[PDB]
Amino acid sequence: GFLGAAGSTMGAASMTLTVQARNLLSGLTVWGIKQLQARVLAVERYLRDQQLLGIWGCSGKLICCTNVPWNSSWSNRNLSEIWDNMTWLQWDKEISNYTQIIYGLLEESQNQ
Amino acid sequence: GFLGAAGSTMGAASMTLTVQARNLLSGLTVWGIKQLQARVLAVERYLRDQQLLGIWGCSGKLICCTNVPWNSSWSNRNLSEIWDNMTWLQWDKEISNYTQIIYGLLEESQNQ
Amino acid sequence: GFLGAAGSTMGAASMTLTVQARNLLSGLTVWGIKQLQARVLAVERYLRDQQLLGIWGCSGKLICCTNVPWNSSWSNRNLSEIWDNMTWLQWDKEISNYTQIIYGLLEESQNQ
Amino acid sequence: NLWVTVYYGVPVWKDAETTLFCASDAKHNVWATHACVPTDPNPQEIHLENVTEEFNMWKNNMVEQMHTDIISLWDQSLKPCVKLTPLCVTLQCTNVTNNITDDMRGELKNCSFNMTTELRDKKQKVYSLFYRLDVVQINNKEYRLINCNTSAITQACPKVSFEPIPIHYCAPAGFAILKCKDKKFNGTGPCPSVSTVQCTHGIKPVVSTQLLLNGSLAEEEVMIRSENITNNAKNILVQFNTPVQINCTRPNNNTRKSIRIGPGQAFYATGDIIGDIRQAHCNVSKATWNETLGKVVKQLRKHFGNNTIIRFANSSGGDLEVTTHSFNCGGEFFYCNTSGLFNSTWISNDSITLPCRIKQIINMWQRIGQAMYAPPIQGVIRCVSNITGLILTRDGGSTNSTTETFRPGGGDMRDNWRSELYKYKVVKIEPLGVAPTRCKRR
Amino acid sequence: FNMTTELRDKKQKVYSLFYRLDVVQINNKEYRLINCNTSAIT
Amino acid sequence: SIRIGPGQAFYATGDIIGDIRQAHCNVSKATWNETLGKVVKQLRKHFGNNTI
Numbered sequence: 053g054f055l056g057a058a059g060s061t062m063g064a065a066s067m068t069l070t071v072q073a074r075n076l077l078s079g080l081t082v083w084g085i086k087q088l089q090a091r092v093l094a095v096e097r098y099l100r101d102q103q104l105l106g107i108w109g110c111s112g113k114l115i116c117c118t119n120v121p122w123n124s125s126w127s128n129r130n131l132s133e134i135w136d137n138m139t140w141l142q143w144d145k146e147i148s149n150y151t152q153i154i155y156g157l158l159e160e161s162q163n164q
Numbered sequence: 165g166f167l168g169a170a171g172s173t174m175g176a177a178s179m180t181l182t183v184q185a186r187n188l189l190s191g192l193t194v195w196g197i198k199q200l201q202a203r204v205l206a207v208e209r210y211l212r213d214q215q216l217l218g219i220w221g222c223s224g225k226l227i228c229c230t231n232v233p234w235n236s237s238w239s240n241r242n243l244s245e246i247w248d249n250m251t252w253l254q255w256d257k258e259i260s261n262y263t264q265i266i267y268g269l270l271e272e273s274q275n276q
Numbered sequence: 277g278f279l280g281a282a283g284s285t286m287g288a289a290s291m292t293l294t295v296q297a298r299n300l301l302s303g304l305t306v307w308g309i310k311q312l313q314a315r316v317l318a319v320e321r322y323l324r325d326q327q328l329l330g331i332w333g334c335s336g337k338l339i340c341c342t343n344v345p346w347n348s349s350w351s352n353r354n355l356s357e358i359w360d361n362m363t364w365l366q367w368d369k370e371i372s373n374y375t376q377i378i379y380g381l382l383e384e385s386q387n388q
Numbered sequence: 389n390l391w392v393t394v395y396y397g398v399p400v401w402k403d404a405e406t407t408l409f410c411a412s413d414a415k416h417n418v419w420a421t422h423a424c425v426p427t428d429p430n431p432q433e434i435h436l437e438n439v440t441e442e443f444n445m446w447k448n449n450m451v452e453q454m455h456t457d458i459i460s461l462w463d464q465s466l467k468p469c470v471k472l473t474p475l476c477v478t479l480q481c482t483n484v485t486n487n488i489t490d491d492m493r494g495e496l497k498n499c500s501f502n503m504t505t506e507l508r509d510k511k512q513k514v515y516s517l518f519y520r521l522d523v524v525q526i527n528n529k530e531y532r533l534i535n536c537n538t539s540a541i542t543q544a545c546p547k548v549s550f551e552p553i554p555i556h557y558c559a560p561a562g563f564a565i566l567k568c569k570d571k572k573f574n575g576t577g578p579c580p581s582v583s584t585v586q587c588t589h590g591i592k593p594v595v596s597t598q599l600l601l602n603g604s605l606a607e608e609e610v611m612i613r614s615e616n617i618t619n620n621a622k623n624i625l626v627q628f629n630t631p632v633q634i635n636c637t638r639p640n641n642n643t644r645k646s647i648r649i650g651p652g653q654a655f656y657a658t659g660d661i662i663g664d665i666r667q668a669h670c671n672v673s674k675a676t677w678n679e680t681l682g683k684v685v686k687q688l689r690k691h692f693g694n695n696t697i698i699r700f701a702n703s704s705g706g707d708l709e710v711t712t713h714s715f716n717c718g719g720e721f722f723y724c725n726t727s728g729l730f731n732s733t734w735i736s737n738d739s740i741t742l743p744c745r746i747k748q749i750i751n752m753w754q755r756i757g758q759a760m761y762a763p764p765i766q767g768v769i770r771c772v773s774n775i776t777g778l779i780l781t782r783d784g785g786s787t788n789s790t791t792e793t794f795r796p797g798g799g800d801m802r803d804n805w806r807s808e809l810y811k812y813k814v815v816k817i818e819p820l821g822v823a824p825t826r827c828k829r830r
Numbered sequence: 831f832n833m834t835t836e837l838r839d840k841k842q843k844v845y846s847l848f849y850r851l852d853v854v855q856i857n858n859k860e861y862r863l864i865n866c867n868t869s870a871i872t
Numbered sequence: 873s874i875r876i877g878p879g880q881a882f883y884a885t886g887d888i889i890g891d892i893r894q895a896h897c898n899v900s901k902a903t904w905n906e907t908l909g910k911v912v913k914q915l916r917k918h919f920g921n922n923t924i
């Protein structure tokens with residue numbers, strides 16, 4: 053179920069995105085205020101993610117293709133050893149350096 | 165206006181969906197906290213419905229056609245006695261048993 | 277950055293919509309309650325705007341073309357003196373009278 | 389070739405419970421209506437054509453929420469007011485003379501005592517007047533306040549008024565309030581004429597026993613409502629068609645004196661009554677009451693037979709609150725004796741005068757551990773009100789009883805606000821449906 | 831010891847049993863609660 | 873119960889009927905010995921095999 057494919061390859065974990073997608077929205081006065089703030093913060097994080105997806109041109113989608121070509125300087129590995137010999141936790145650690153450049157390229161490509 | 169077509173047929177109530185749609189979002193410390201929780205709960209319900217619609221492939225729509233064929237074991241009535249001789253309150257009471265099967269079929273059909 | 281093109285023409289300010297779009301969502305017990313209400317109100321305003329855009333048929337867009345023709349009685353200025361010799365603050369003050377008619381026309385045009 | 393089509397915004401609802409919020413028309417009041425949202429001038433009411441609903445008067449949650457809100461507001465209103473802890477001392481009391489009447493003999497007492505000052509070094513000898521119901525003798529004579537062995541007394545803030553004002557209950561987003569428009573609806577069952585709203589009509593939280601005051605009137609006939617009419621352990625709610633005017637008064641000219649009991653703390657005592665001393669009382673019309681009772685028995689003869697003798701007697705046992713008509717007339721709490729109203733039998737210009745009593749130490753909501761002291765009001769007091777309902781209970785006469793006896797009841801305030809929130813229910817909208825069409829996704 | 835009554839006019843002589851760890855002697859004998867120089871007891 | 877004010881009571885100790893004895897706890901000796909043996913056996917993995 054939830055986070056079940058955390059140890060599987062990137063390809064195997066691409067077929068269960070809905071499980072993680074669903075578990076992000078609903079899955080005295082001192083304690084009452086504390087619990088309320090968490091519920092507001094989850095909504096805010098969800099709305100920020102949705103706004104980013106909509107700005108990129110990918111509103112209402114779990115997998116979305118773009119027109120931005122992949123620079124070989126971000127990663128030189130081929131598709132056989134990325135989608136079949138790696139997990140998302142390892143991929144994030146590898147591409148954590150180039151994330152902002154890719155996000156900016158996506159935004160400016162969609163706008164223009 | 166609001167809930168005006170609750171006694172009309174299913175066909176007549178399909179032309180006034182926006183009236184109900186827009187009346188779901190905005191239409192001491194003890195009492196202050198109580199009112200805040202209701203406003204958070206309405207937002208949470210709205211966001212859950214929107215996420216479900218987006219997952220089904222129907223984001224930003226009031227009426228949405230799908231690729232899932234209608235099983236005759238869910239209901240045997242023809243279109244003449246459903247859209248012209250029936251209300252939504254009666255239709256819900258009849259198809260309440262098969263709702264989860266249809267929802268799962270919609271999700272797995274959109275994903276694949 | 278934010279509100280940078282408030283003195284520029286309407287044409288120049290049409291290329292920086294995402295700057296204003298981003299700065300609308302995240303950019304004792306007495307004070308704790310006051311701050312929470314501000315965030316809830318901002319979320320509600322954002323959700324109402326998004327629902328209106330979705331109803332108009334413009335879900336997940338910053339610029340959206342419609343099928344509603346422009347009535348000459350709303351404004352008689354030509355495109356050369358609107359997008360090149362005018363700002364949005366002046367345009368709002370002129371078309372504030374006809375906004376509701378245009379909104380109703382957009383809704384009834386999209387529904388039909 | 390049929391396909392599933394999804395519709396968002398369909399008119400479907402379910403039964404639900406939620407928190408409704410308060411609204412009031414657009415300053416010192418017990419029920420803080422300044423914090424409630426202002427009300428629209430012309431509310432929207434949408435008649436739902438061809439819609440039949442099911443209502444249950446006796447399983448409504450708006451009544452529970454209203455009771456809780458009223459209790460909470462009453463408790464909140466008493467926080468910043470003066471505590472009367474130094475008033476639990478021994479008083480030396482004498483009887484009151486100088487132009488009392490025969491019926492007022494022994495009802496007032498003149499009590500002297502020692503009280504603290506603004507300096508924590510000395511005392512002052514002061515005196516006041518107390519009603520007989522507020523002091524208990526401890527063996528002139530030595531008395532003490534009735535409450536100084538069970539609870540503590542808080543003095544009501546004199547700037548806050550007890551006047552009830554209408555309030556409206558509103559439903560949040562995603563909920564609606566269904567309202568029954570049937571004119572002969574008896575509380576439970578199907579209502580075929582239904583409308584939808586978001587706010588209820590202005591309801592005044594009037595607290596009274598044995599008689600409903602300043603309320604709503606039935607449109608056609610006198611209405612009789614009960615959860616199980618054959619069960620004598622249930623109460624009977626009677627709603628009038630026309631109101632019965634009642635005039636209540638306290639005729640004594642009272643004086644108020646302020647005594648400083650500490651730094652920034654004062655106590656309002658009764659001074660001297662200038663003139664004569666008489667008994668507070670209420671007047672009702674005899675002919676109007678007779679006509680109303682005739683209509684009530686006419687409506688009652690539809691559940692118990694056509695040849696049964698129906699007689700009205702008075703209350704049977706209990707404390708002062710439940711055996712008397714207790715109400716509040718401009719800051720003073722009245723307990724009136726209604727033995728002249730419910731005393732008659734029915735077989736198939738003038739006035740009625742009800743004597744009343746006044747009390748100053750008040751225990752509300754049938755609770756213990758908290759008491760309130762009502763400061764005296766200056767001058768003569770007069771009020772006029774409408775009787776618009778009744779609460780009755782039936783005696784379980786067994787062994788082939790051909791007569792029925794009804795006695796006034798009350799005590800539980802949930803039945804006071806159940807006579808106003810009896811035609812409303814709360815529903816939750818479910819705007820998602822699926823149906824077979826002939827459109828396929830492209 | 832002497833304790834206040836429900837009336838702010840008189841006292842009552844009462845007694846109780848205390849463990850040795852709860853009372854400190856102040857120079858039968860005169861004792862006091864261990865806490866009545868540092869804090870209040872609820 | 874001693875009434876110390878309007879609606880306030882204080883719960884004092886009265887008299888102890890019978891004899892007066894000391895409160896105490898009992899633990900098992902063999903079980904405690906076995907547990908201490910296991911604990912010292914596990915402790916001897918960080919400080920050596922010949923340490924007392």
Ligand SMILES: *[C@@H]1O[C@H](CO)[C@@H](O[C@@H]2O[C@H](CO)[C@@H](O[C@@H]3O[C@H](CO)[C@@H](O)[C@H](O[C@H]4O[C@H](CO)[C@@H](O)[C@H](O)[C@@H]4O)[C@@H]3O)[C@H](O)[C@H]2NC(C)=O)[C@H](O)[C@H]1NC(C)=O
Nearest residue numbers: 547549551552594601602715716717718770771772773774
């Ligand atoms: C049922 O409804 C009737 C009609 O509304 C109601 O009778 C009203 O009672 C009130 C309270 O006694 C009366 O209002 C008072 O009238 C005079 C003139 O103003 C004064 O005694 C009062 O004002 C003084 O006190 C106020 C309190 O703070 C001060 O603000 C003010 O400055 C004055 O000092 C007060 O206004 C009202 O006049 C009557 N109305 C009629 C038509 O007689 C009755 O009480 C209700 N029944 C029940 C059981 O609640």
Ligand SMILES: *[C@@H]1O[C@H](CO)[C@@H](O[C@@H]2O[C@H](CO)[C@@H](O)[C@H](O)[C@H]2NC(C)=O)[C@H](O)[C@H]1NC(C)=O
Nearest residue numbers: 483484485486498499500514515517659660661
């Ligand atoms: C209540 O008793 C008080 C005394 O406790 C009375 O006040 C005194 O009345 C006498 C007789 O008229 C005067 O000489 C005194 O000056 C008054 N004051 C005091 C402080 O003693 C008072 O009249 C009594 N009131 C009633 C209504 O009987």
Ligand SMILES: *[C@@H]1O[C@H](CO)[C@@H](O[C@@H]2O[C@H](CO)[C@@H](O)[C@H](O)[C@H]2NC(C)=O)[C@H](O)[C@H]1NC(C)=O
Nearest residue numbers: 614615616617618619620621622782784785786
């Ligand atoms: C209303 O109350 C009456 C009694 O006043 C109930 O009738 C009783 O039913 C029980 C069995 O449930 C019988 O043993 C009693 O003899 C009945 N009493 C009488 C006087 O006939 C009746 O069931 C109640 N109605 C509801 C709906 O609860």
Ligand SMILES: *[C@@H]1O[C@H](CO)[C@@H](O[C@@H]2O[C@H](CO)[C@@H](O)[C@H](O)[C@H]2NC(C)=O)[C@H](O)[C@H]1NC(C)=O
Nearest residue numbers: 634635636637669670671672739740741770771
């Ligand atoms: C209630 O009615 C009584 C009786 O009419 C009024 O009391 C006084 O009655 C006497 C005769 O018994 C009349 O001479 C007086 O005129 C009446 N008093 C007044 C002030 O008129 C009593 O006042 C009435 N009370 C109310 C509240 O209306």
Ligand SMILES: *[C@@H]1O[C@H](CO)[C@@H](O[C@@H]2O[C@H](CO)[C@@H](O)[C@H](O)[C@H]2NC(C)=O)[C@H](O)[C@H]1NC(C)=O
Nearest residue numbers: 633634635636671672673674738739740771772
């Ligand atoms: C209660 O008091 C009202 C006035 O506050 C009385 O109404 C008056 O009645 C007299 C006598 O019939 C009429 O002359 C007046 O015109 C009435 N005044 C108003 C404003 O209507 C009423 O009769 C009293 N009720 C009772 C039962 O005594």
Ligand SMILES: *[C@@H]1O[C@H](CO)[C@@H](O[C@@H]2O[C@H](CO)[C@@H](O)[C@H](O)[C@H]2NC(C)=O)[C@H](O)[C@H]1NC(C)=O
Nearest residue numbers: 701702703704705706710711712725726727731
């Ligand atoms: C109901 O009415 C009866 C009859 O009037 C009241 O009984 C009277 O009680 C008083 C003392 O309160 C006695 O002096 C009378 O002799 C009693 N009358 C009879 C006929 O026995 C009874 O108190 C009333 N109940 C109430 C007011 O709750």
Ligand SMILES: *[C@@H]1O[C@H](CO)[C@@H](O[C@@H]2O[C@H](CO)[C@@H](O)[C@H](O)[C@H]2NC(C)=O)[C@H](O)[C@H]1NC(C)=O
Nearest residue numbers: 702708711712724725726727728731742743745
């Ligand atoms: C309520 O009123 C009735 C009728 O006036 C009272 O009954 C009278 O009570 C007095 C004493 O208060 C007796 O002397 C009378 O004989 C009673 N009358 C009858 C006809 O029995 C009743 O006591 C009052 N209730 C109270 C004062 O609590």
Ligand SMILES: *[C@@H]1O[C@H](CO)[C@@H](O[C@@H]2O[C@H](CO)[C@@H](O)[C@H](O)[C@H]2NC(C)=O)[C@H](O)[C@H]1NC(C)=O
Nearest residue numbers: 895896897898899900901902903904905906907
């Ligand atoms: C602690 O008390 C328990 C019982 O509460 C003791 O267990 C009992 O031991 C006796 C003697 O061997 C047996 O007959 C009982 O059957 C036991 N009872 C239960 C419920 O098992 C236990 O021995 C006591 N422990 C110590 C250390 O004294």
Ligand SMILES: *[C@@H]1O[C@H](CO)[C@@H](O)[C@H](O)[C@H]1NC(C)=O
Nearest residue numbers: 478479480500501502511513
């Ligand atoms: C007030 O104090 C005086 C002086 O101690 C005392 O004699 C008297 O009994 C007290 N009570 C009164 C006057 O009620």
Ligand SMILES: *[C@@H]1O[C@H](CO)[C@@H](O)[C@H](O)[C@H]1NC(C)=O
Nearest residue numbers: 524525534535536537538539
């Ligand atoms: C308080 O005193 C009254 C009058 O003596 C008595 O009836 C009552 O029981 C007392 N209350 C308590 C809680 O003991």
Ligand SMILES: *[C@@H]1O[C@H](CO)[C@@H](O)[C@H](O)[C@H]1NC(C)=O
Nearest residue numbers: 601602603630631772773774
């Ligand atoms: C009392 O009844 C009269 C006559 O029907 C009516 O005008 C008035 O509004 C009613 N209500 C009050 C609170 O007096």
Ligand SMILES: *[C@@H]1O[C@H](CO)[C@@H](O)[C@H](O)[C@H]1NC(C)=O
Nearest residue numbers: 574576577578613614615617
């Ligand atoms: C109320 O009316 C319903 C039918 O509408 C009936 O079943 C029920 O017994 C009635 N209750 C009373 C107390 O008359």
Ligand SMILES: *[C@@H]1O[C@H](CO)[C@@H](O)[C@H](O)[C@H]1NC(C)=O
Nearest residue numbers: 640641642662663766767768
């Ligand atoms: C009450 O007494 C005051 C003070 O003497 C006086 O002004 C007022 O007129 C009196 N009210 C009456 C007699 O109704």
Ligand SMILES: *[C@@H]1O[C@H](CO)[C@@H](O)[C@H](O)[C@H]1NC(C)=O
Nearest residue numbers: 674675677678679682734738
């Ligand atoms: C009330 O009506 C009854 C029944 O007609 C009658 O016996 C009685 O005398 C009337 N009372 C009055 C008019 O005071």
Ligand SMILES: *[C@@H]1O[C@H](CO)[C@@H](O)[C@H](O)[C@H]1NC(C)=O
Nearest residue numbers: 686689690691693694695736
């Ligand atoms: C009771 O008597 C009245 C008298 O008007 C009559 O109308 C009604 O039908 C009777 N009810 C019966 C006999 O059940």
Ligand SMILES: *[C@@H]1O[C@H](CO)[C@@H](O)[C@H](O)[C@H]1NC(C)=O
Nearest residue numbers: 726727728729730731732733
């Ligand atoms: C009750 O009614 C009877 C019969 O008219 C009468 O004698 C008696 O005095 C009445 N009791 C009252 C009014 O308290």
